[PDB]
A paper describes a structure:
Bacterial lytic polysaccharide monooxygenases (LPMOs) are known to oxidize the most abundant and recalcitrant polymers in Nature, namely cellulose and chitin. The genome of the model actinomycete Streptomyces coelicolor A3(2) encodes seven putative LPMOs, of which, upon phylogenetic analysis, four group with typical chitin-oxidizing LPMOs, two with typical cellulose-active LPMOs, and one which stands out by being part of a subclade of non-characterized enzymes. While showing several structural and functional features typical for bacterial cellulose active LPMOs, ScLPMO10D is only active on chitin.
The structure of the catalytic domain of ScLPMO10D (residues 34–214, lacking the linker and the CWSS), hereafter called ScLPMO10DCD, was determined to 1.37 Å resolution with a single molecule in the asymmetric unit using the crystal structure of LPMO10A from Tectaria macrodonta (Tma12; PDB ID: 6IF738) as the starting model. The active site of ScLPMO10D is formed by His34 and His134, which coordinate the bound copper cofactor in a T-shaped geometry. No water molecules were found adjacent to the copper, which indicates that the copper had been photo-reduced during data collection. The residues in the secondary coordination sphere resemble those found in C1-oxidizing cellulose-active AA10 LPMOs, such as ScLPMO10C26 and in the atypical chitin-active CjLPMO10A44. In ScLPMO10D, an additional arginine (Arg79) is interacting with Glu203 that together with Arg198 forms a remarkable arrangement that has, to the best of our knowledge, not been observed in any other LPMO. Generally, it is worth noting the considerable variation in second sphere residues, the functional implications of which are largely unknown. It is also worth noting that the arrangement of a catalytically crucial glutamate (Glu203) interacting closely with two positively charged residues (Arg79 and Arg198) really stands out from the active site arrangements found in other LPMOs. Like CjLPMO10A44, ScLPMO10D shows a “hybrid”-type catalytic center with features known from both cellulose-active and chitin-active LPMO10s. While Arg198 and Glu203 in ScLPMO10D are common to cellulose-active LPMO10s, Asn76 and Thr131 are common to chitin-active LPMOs.
Author numbering: 1 to 181
The structure:
């Protein structure tokens, strides 16, 4: 259980605003669409029986909720999700982990031309060249820390992190909004 901490996941960012009266238009829309409970369960975007079949199990437009209706407010195609500013180059990812598990993280970045006003699909992600991978990182202080590389990009983008357990078919999913502008 967990979610991306740096760059902060969309679910954790809405939680940090105060789920009962969010600050941003985007998080207010997420709560009107899917309720406040999702934000308290920020560490629980999961598929119990994924077994590496992410693209088979998760429809386009359902990546940020992992096709769980509880999290459907996170699927909105907003141009205005609050975003972490990033730059191309080496990057130290921090994944906020509330329950450690053996397994592998892969982090994918949207392709050039990404339009956040359209639903997120697998086709929008560069799945052939993950920006980071980490197998069995060591939890410390409530985080996994692992490095990768953000490639050259120009404007609004999204990072999609898949955490597949190795002792279990369960996986966890995180989308983080970023901008290179
Ligand atoms: Cu867990
Ligand atoms: Na975005």
């Amino acid at each position: 259980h967990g979610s991306m901490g740096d760059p902060v996941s969309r679910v954790s960012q809405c939680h940090a605003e105060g789920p009962e009266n969010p600050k941003s238009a985007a998080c207010r829309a997420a709560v009107a669409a899917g309720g406040t409970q999702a934000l308290y369960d920020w560490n629980g975007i999961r598929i119990g029986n994924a077994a590496g079949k992410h693209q088979e199990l998760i429809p386009d437009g359902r990546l940020c909720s992992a096709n769980d209706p509880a999290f459907k407010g996170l699927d909105l195609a907003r141009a205005d999700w609050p975003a972490t500013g990033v730059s191309s180059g080496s990057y130290t990812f921090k994944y906020r982990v509330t329950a450690p598990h053996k397994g592998t993280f892969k982090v994918y970045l949207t392709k050039p031309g990404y339009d956040p006003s359209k639903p997120l699909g697998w086709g929008d992600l560069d799945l052939s060249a993950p920006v980071a991978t980490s197998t069995d990182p060591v939890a410390s202080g409530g985080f996994y820390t692992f490095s990768g590389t953000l490639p050259e990009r120009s404007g609004k983008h999204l990072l999609y992190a898949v955490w597949q357990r190795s002792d279990s078919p369960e996986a966890f999913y995180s989308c983080s909004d970023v901008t290179f502008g």
